[PDB]
Amino acid sequence: SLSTEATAKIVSEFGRDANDTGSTEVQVALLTAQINHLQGHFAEHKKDHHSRRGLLRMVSQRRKLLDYLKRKDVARYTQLIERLGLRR
Amino acid sequence: MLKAGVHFGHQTRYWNPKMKPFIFGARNKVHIINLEKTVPMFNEALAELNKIASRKGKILFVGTKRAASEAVKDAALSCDQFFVNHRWLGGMLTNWKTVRQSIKRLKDLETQSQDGTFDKLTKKEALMRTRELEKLENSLGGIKDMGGLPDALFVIDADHEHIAIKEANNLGIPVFAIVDTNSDPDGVDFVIPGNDDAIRAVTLYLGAVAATVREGRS
Amino acid sequence: SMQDPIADMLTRIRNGQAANKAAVTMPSSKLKVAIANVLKEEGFIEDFKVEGDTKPELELTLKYFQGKAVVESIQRVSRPGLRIYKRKDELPKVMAGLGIAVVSTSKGVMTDRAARQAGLGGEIICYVA
RNA sequence: CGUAAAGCGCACGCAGGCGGUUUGUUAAGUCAGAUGUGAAAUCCCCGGGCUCAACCUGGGAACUGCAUCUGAUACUGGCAAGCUUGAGUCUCGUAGAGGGGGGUAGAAUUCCAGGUGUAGCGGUGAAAUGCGUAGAGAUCUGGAGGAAUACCGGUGGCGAAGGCGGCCCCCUGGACGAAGACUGACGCUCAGGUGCGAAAGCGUGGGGAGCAAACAGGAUUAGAUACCCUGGUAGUCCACGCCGUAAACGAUGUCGACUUGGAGGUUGUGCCCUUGAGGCGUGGCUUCCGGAGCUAACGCGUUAAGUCGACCGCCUGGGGAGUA
């Protein structure tokens, strides 16, 4: 699911450092990466509910990473959604 | 202090938590007691029995297992205080008012059978009283002399005689128990780490107690 | 999730006293020793010592007159659910006044019995008996 | 609040409540002293006055408060800067009836067509219904279908819960362990809200072997709108919608800390001798028995009903009624 190579590009273009595995904006980006893909399995296969519970985890969890950022570095949050085209 | 190679530590894979201080652990999943925090311990055990012993004490030895009984008998009437080796009637102490009356049956028979009243009846019928004499001798025999109530109740085990601790520590008679690394010391007054299930060890304990008991008499 | 660490620090003793432990440890914080400062200072718990530079974990040593605990009772009061502050003139007595109560003044955490005679009072934390 | 009344069936989650650790700061909460206002009578305390009393009455205390000034700064909050245990991301593997889709194989069931061949077959406590000389049942050969996956299979595993089982492939969720990396409290819970949610049932449309509500027939019985027997519609099966209730039950809310043992099971991983089915650790999950303690008892017992802390839900006699 978004295999190792697919991952590395996200951190790469969201690189504060090589092994910046854990910065937020990287995560949100990965979250974005998988979710956009995941709507590929759910366009069809709509009845696949069990997977849905997992998809929900990511979205909402990603959201929780949003609000942490906003109240911690608006320059990061504001640069972010405007480049990852968020907010419906 | 290691005068013997059989007291060292034994009894099980299934220990009992309350036996935690005094331990080494070896192969076969058998604990080996830490004799180091044993030797000092029974010394005052040996000592404390003596102070009341020298005060013309009333010491009880209780044993069972048929492989622990003999040494006790060999050691208690050795010169002095009373013992019990066969199945000790649960209640010889906390209900001694009733057991005491039993001895009147015994002291009768014990005398009658050999010079007194044993044959003014039919042999098989007169036989029945004989068994009762042995039957009384078998269990109650070791207390006949006791009278009143104890001053101390030395024992070999804690579990196999679990009925002692809950009783002896109920009228308060000071007990002295060699608890295996299996038993529960809770009620025992002077908990002596050691082995029950041995024989060369137990006659050492008896032999250990046999010493100062022989001084107490005064 | 471990929202009242002091409650926990109170908790540990009551349990350690139950199981005849010898010493108990915890993620020691600035506050935790302050309470510990008192407890030892009045003699309910034997000596404390703290090791650490990144994981400072105090080890409070208990105490026993007999095998029974010496802390017959201990009780977290000021809950994060419910802060309760009492005035100088409002300070209660615990165990006819012989059991002590740990209160927080503006002179630092200190037994009410001594904080009473500092002439002021504040947040009550726990009791002991 | 396991069984007595009472943990929503389960999950995500906004408001709300609560929050790890370090330093500085601020002074909201908190706190000390003071100040003003807190009407009197009434209540209380020592008095006093009617012969006493009730009653009157002097003086004090008190009126648990509110606003302001002045500070105290532990704790709590705001704000600023951190830190790593909480939490989360990546590197690599491992196990799994997790979920959806699309193929597929064997066994049997009934059916239908042939060959053979002949009076029963089926059934029951004993019968009859029914099927059969227009030739069954039996056996052989073959085809057509539908639904379920023996053995493996196990107080095994997986999933939030409902639930999940032949094999294969594609799509896809979660979990666990290693040695490190990295963000640096990003948390815990959550009325309302959203979603899921056995079975039976509803609606539209496909299927229909077996099973089978309803119903039919034969029996049983005193009667037998049943228990039994022969059949049999819906239904169950598939798709898409719907319903949202169940003894949706470990009758045990969620998260977290702590608190003596024993014996198995399952699944990772470190080491010693794999020197030979091993021996010694370290983690996840799980089964029975059990100690302190707890509970009304029964029992729970490191996965507590023990010891606390955060948040929610819920109870307040029986029937009436889970009804109007």
Side-chain angles (χ1 to χ4, degrees):
Chain A
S1 319
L2 192 145
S3 181
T4 309
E5 174 58 62
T7 75
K9 178 174 58 184
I10 303 308
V11 54
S12 293
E13 71 97 330
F14 267 121
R16 188 292 300 294
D17 182 75
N19 286 71
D20 199 312
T21 53
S23 66
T24 65
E25 65 289 353
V26 166
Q27 300 179 54
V28 203
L30 296 185
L31 278 290
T32 306
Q34 185 48 287
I35 288 183
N36 291 112
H37 177 45
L38 202 55
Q39 184 158 178
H41 162 41
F42 269 117
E44 179 263 309
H45 280 304
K46 56 195 64 59
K47 282 293 196 66
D48 174 37
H49 307 82
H50 286 51
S51 310
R52 194 69 56 60
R53 197 194 171 207
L55 175 41
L56 195 71
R57 169 188 171 183
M58 273 159 192
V59 178
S60 58
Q61 180 298 295
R62 163 266 280 310
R63 179 51 182 299
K64 287 176 182 291
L65 282 169
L66 275 263
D67 298 300
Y68 161 63
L69 199 63
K70 184 176 186 179
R71 61 184 178 64
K72 287 306 171 185
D73 211 59
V74 190
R76 289 175 196 275
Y77 166 65
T78 53
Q79 71 84 52
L80 189 62
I81 66 165
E82 202 59 289
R83 79 180 309 299
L84 244 51
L86 305 172
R87 288 303 161 164
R88 312 310 176 205
Chain B
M1 181 268 269
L2 192 62
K3 42 194 175 187
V6 178
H7 52 288
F8 64 101
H10 294 71
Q11 176 69 307
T12 193
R13 46 157 175 175
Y14 42 102
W15 64 327
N16 182 48
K18 288 160 284 298
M19 309 311 241
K20 185 85 171 184
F22 39 109
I23 295 295
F24 283 125
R27 51 149 282 187
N28 182 61
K29 300 159 287 301
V30 62
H31 281 290
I32 308 302
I33 316 176
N34 190 314
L35 177 68
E36 172 48 53
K37 45 181 57 184
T38 308
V39 182
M41 303 191 134
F42 54 63
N43 275 122
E44 57 273 16
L46 289 185
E48 289 302 302
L49 76 95
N50 200 312
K51 308 289 73 182
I52 49 181
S54 293
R55 200 169 68 179
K56 301 171 64 186
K58 292 190 177 296
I59 316 312
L60 191 159
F61 295 8
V62 48
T64 309
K65 294 81 65 183
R66 285 304 191 73
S69 61
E70 287 69 55
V72 186
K73 179 190 62 176
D74 286 63
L77 258 180
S78 69
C79 54
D80 284 301
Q81 311 307 304
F82 45 95
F83 72 111
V84 280
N85 70 295
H86 261 272
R87 178 205 107 84
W88 170 48
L89 303 190
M92 284 192 221
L93 286 303
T94 171
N95 212 27
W96 186 78
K97 59 193 295 177
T98 55
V99 191
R100 162 186 58 187
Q101 172 198 61
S102 179
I103 295 73
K104 200 143 305 308
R105 279 303 312 171
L106 182 161
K107 297 297 291 298
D108 183 63
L109 294 176
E110 165 199 308
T111 47
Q112 313 317 128
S113 60
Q114 60 175 300
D115 64 294
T117 315
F118 58 92
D119 64 307
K120 268 68 69 177
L121 297 70
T122 304
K123 306 76 171 181
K124 193 191 84 177
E125 283 48 59
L127 190 170
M128 193 56 95
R129 296 177 56 184
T130 308
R131 171 182 287 161
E132 192 172 358
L133 168 49
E134 200 300 297
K135 173 193 171 183
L136 265 56
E137 179 193 303
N138 191 334
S139 60
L140 185 62
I143 304 300
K144 65 163 67 169
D145 305 298
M146 182 273 267
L149 291 166
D151 213 299
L153 193 138
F154 178 76
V155 61
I156 291 296
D157 197 304
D159 285 314
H160 202 294
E161 282 65 67
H162 62 60
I163 192 160
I165 308 174
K166 320 305 294 301
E167 292 186 308
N169 194 52
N170 203 294
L171 210 75
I173 301 298
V175 307
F176 304 86
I178 294 63
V179 297
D180 279 308
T181 67
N182 187 49
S183 298
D184 185 355
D186 274 359
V188 190
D189 290 297
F190 301 123
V191 52
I192 290 178
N195 323 95
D196 171 38
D197 302 306
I199 180 61
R200 198 174 72 143
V202 305
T203 181
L204 184 160
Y205 294 137
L206 283 294
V209 186
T212 56
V213 61
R214 288 202 54 180
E215 182 286 297
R217 74 289 178 279
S218 294
Chain C
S1 70
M2 66 281 279
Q3 292 161 234
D4 194 46
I6 292 303
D8 299 358
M9 196 281 248
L10 269 312
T11 299
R12 319 179 86 71
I13 298 85
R14 200 159 54 277
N15 291 304
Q17 288 290 55
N20 288 337
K21 307 291 284 184
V24 203
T25 48
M26 56 280 282
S28 172
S29 56
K30 185 180 185 176
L31 169 54
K32 289 194 187 62
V33 184
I35 287 175
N37 286 146
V38 174
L39 301 161
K40 163 63 177 53
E41 181 53 62
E42 188 44 65
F44 281 120
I45 63 172
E46 196 50 57
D47 192 60
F48 66 116
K49 64 197 70 175
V50 55
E51 304 99 312
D53 182 64
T54 173
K55 284 292 169 294
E57 204 159 299
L58 169 50
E59 190 172 72
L60 295 171
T61 302
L62 307 172
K63 197 175 179 177
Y64 304 113
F65 165 69
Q66 289 299 303
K68 49 166 174 286
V70 50
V71 171
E72 56 182 62
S73 169
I74 199 167
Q75 195 48 65
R76 173 47 162 181
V77 186
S78 186
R79 305 184 310 177
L82 179 57
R83 299 258 182 285
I84 62 175
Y85 305 91
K86 297 297 179 186
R87 294 193 60 180
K88 160 70 186 66
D89 308 292
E90 295 188 293
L91 289 173
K93 300 195 309 303
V94 173
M95 192 63 84
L98 70 77
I100 70 173
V102 166
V103 79
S104 200
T105 54
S106 301
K107 317 276 187 170
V109 189
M110 66 197 289
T111 296
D112 65 303
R113 183 58 295 185
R116 193 84 77 74
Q117 298 311 68
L120 69 196
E123 190 163 4
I124 287 69
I125 280 175
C126 70
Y127 314 115
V128 202

